[PDB]
Structure 1
């Protein structure tokens, strides 16, 4: 069974932010318009017995002080009075400002994603679902005491922490345009959570990590976590095929060597050629979309898997992508063919898919070899540090 997190309240909260507007409603209504919902098990967001149990869950990663400030930020934005100088300074100390502003539902909005992704992890742990999807989750930039990149609470870290505390190894795969720095940092010292981000990196591009660290070198973990954080920064302009060839052997080698108990995939849609960032040239095409190639490969491992959203600022094209990811997950997990019309069906948000109303996005389509050698050596070093049994040449042959 394939689970997916939704709910009426969940939907309201996921649609209450100024940056992401109603993207979540488009995604779930397009999934519904394509008649995928009856194939999927609804996973309800987690709710708690008391404020103390809620704090205990969230502060498994975040500091109490940051959680307190985030809740105060919501309360301050629910009254009319301007913030005081002291409250502005408090908020600045947690980077609750600039690109992570307050708004009337900021705490409930942020928490909802945590509630969704923790319930998703639970459904995998008890074996109710083989795969769970949460298109309201994936907020990989939030840090223990710092908002970042419109990420206020890191639902991924909390879900992964629940998975590993259930020996258990989690492989985290971050397909977002941006480096998954918050998840990487949370598990920097943990060999049991191997993180892998593929992303654009270049001078001045957010958040600035996931690349050569200023012959400069790649940091990759520390302590017993040495060699356990993997990164693949890519030049702008990369298409589906090159991105797929870049990531494919890495994914397979990580699975062979790490043998994860769970995979967690962030599927940020900002690599689409039609995303406003206009950096990568990925598509949602399915004859091949780099996203669908990656997800199909990961699912072919038959490891219990969490699929999360993330970036994606062209809301209809993010819906078009994540609808195909959802249909692909059903087909791969259940072995049951999913036929998706190339035309958007009529539904609530039909007009948002103008002017053509097609499921395809509207787009006419040595460095990587050096990163592969680097990553293969790091993986050898990770296996050597952690005394993992594996065939070197089977792994080497993948590349």
Structure 2
């Protein structure tokens, strides 16, 4: 089946942050408004038998001191008094500040995404689901002891750790931003191949995933993980077709050579032409959306796959995209036509889809060849180092 992570408390917690507001509610309520819920298997978020068991799960990646600090941040933001200077310094030492502020539910909110994506991994492992979706997860910037980019706990790393320890995993990051936290976690691990496509330019967050600044070279992993971290930085303005042609052959070659046991896809929606970032020009169009082209290709591999959320700051349009991603997954996996009306159905958040109330977003539409050459050589090097065999010319022909 196709699983999807939701529940009543989970929804309250995913909607409890200042930055992402009620986005999760719009997403799940649009999927429900389109009558997709009866097609899907609800995956309940994971819950633990003790604080010690929760800490054991979370500190598989994060340091205990960082988890302790994130929990203290929540407790302090649940009292009226201001923080002491010592507590400000403590939070500064974990970057729990500026773009990663505290709020009264910051730990419960961050932990919830971990609970969802770990439960999603488990459903794939025990083969209850062939694909699982978690639109409350995808927080790819969080590091072992550092919050970053409004990501406080890295649910993706923790899910991938569960999958690999249950084996090779292919991680695909479609967000506008470089998936640096996941890349870094698995920098020395050849069994987790990471691939991020993103915008990169001077001063643009987080700054990695591109030529490294001697002449600038492309770092790609280290130790036994050399060649195992892949990146495709793109300049602004790219449309559906060109983004699709940019990553299509890379994805297909990665599946052919890696032969992964699991695929984890981060599907951050901030590449949409209508996102307030206004960098890329992707759509949710479905006759083609770069997102739907990528997800359809990945699902055609028939590999157990985790689909996560991530960025996306135009909430109605992020719901518009992820609702189509969800319908496509049902169609590809179950083999069962999904007929979505081009008009937003009436439901609690119908008014947020003004003024036209259509499912299509309100948008009217050499450097990549060099990257493909570089990426082909890296995949060959990765295959060489890891004693994987594959038709070189059949792979080279994909590009």
Query: TM-score scaled by structure 2?
Result: 1.00
Question: How much does 1:65 deviate?
Answer: 0.1
Provide, for residues 158-212 of structure 1, a one-character-per-residue CA deviation record: whole Å limited to 9, x for no partner: 000000001x000000000000000000000000000000000000000000000
- Find the counterpart in structure 1 of residue 310 from structure 2: 310
Provide, for residues 65-90 of structure 1, a one-character-per-residue CA deviation record: whole Å limited to 9, x for no partner: 00000000000000000000000000
1:357 and 2:365 matched? no
3-state SS, counterpart of residue 398 of structure 1: coil
Provide, for residues 120-176 of structure 1, a one-character-per-residue CA deviation record: whole Å limited to 9, x for no partner: 00000000000000000000000000000000000000000000001x000000000
Q: Distance in 1 between matches of 2:127 and 2:359?
A: 33
3-state SS, counterpart of residue 279 of structure 1: coil
Q: Distance in 2 between matches of 1:95 and 1:163?
A: 29
1:212 and 2:246 matched? no
Q: Distance in 2 between matches of 1:77 and 1:8?
A: 24
Q: Distance in 1 between matches of 2:3 and 2:347?
A: 23
Question: How much does 1:6 deviate?
Answer: 0.1
What number of residue pairs does the alignment pair up?
398
Provide, for residues 248-270 of structure 1, a one-character-per-residue CA deviation record: whole Å limited to 9, x for no partner: 00000000000000000000000
3-state SS, counterpart of residue 172 of structure 1: strand
- Find the counterpart in structure 2 of residue 333 from structure 1: 333
Question: How much does 1:52 deviate?
Answer: 0.1
Q: Distance in 2 between matches of 1:136 and 1:20?
A: 10
3-state SS, counterpart of residue 393 of structure 2: helix
3-state SS, counterpart of residue 219 of structure 1: coil
Provide, for residues 229-266 of structure 1, a one-character-per-residue CA deviation record: whole Å limited to 9, x for no partner: 00000000000000000000000000000000000000
Larger mean CA deviation between 212-221 and 104-113 belongs to 212-221
- Find the counterpart in structure 2 of residue 284 from structure 1: 284
3-state SS, counterpart of residue 389 of structure 2: coil
RMSD: 0.2
Q: Distance in 1 between matches of 2:165 and 2:276?
A: 38
Provide, for residues 352-380 of structure 1, a one-character-per-residue CA deviation record: whole Å limited to 9, x for no partner: 00000000000010000000000000000
Q: Distance in 1 between matches of 2:394 and 2:255?
A: 12
3-state SS, counterpart of residue 264 of structure 1: strand
Q: Distance in 2 between matches of 1:36 and 1:218?
A: 43
Question: How much does 1:62 deviate?
Answer: 0.1
Question: How much does 1:216 deviate?
Answer: 1.1
Provide, for residues 307-346 of structure 1, a one-character-per-residue CA deviation record: whole Å limited to 9, x for no partner: 0000000000000000000000000000000000000000
Q: Distance in 2 between matches of 1:212 and 1:397?
A: 26
Matching of residues 1-399 of structure 1 within 5 Å: 1-166=1-166, 168-214=167-213, 215-399=215-399
Q: Distance in 2 between matches of 1:289 and 1:318?
A: 13
Q: Distance in 2 between matches of 1:74 and 1:276?
A: 29
3-state SS, counterpart of residue 220 of structure 2: coil
Q: Distance in 2 between matches of 1:232 and 1:37?
A: 35
Larger mean CA deviation between 210-219 and 260-269 belongs to 210-219
Q: Distance in 1 between matches of 2:372 and 2:248?
A: 11
Q: Distance in 1 between matches of 2:197 and 2:337?
A: 30
Q: Distance in 2 between matches of 1:100 and 1:64?
A: 19
Runs of 4+ in 1 over 2 A off after TM superposition: none
Q: Which runs of 5+ in 1 are unaligned?
A: none
3-state SS, counterpart of residue 55 of structure 1: helix
Q: Which runs of 5+ in 2 are unaligned?
A: none
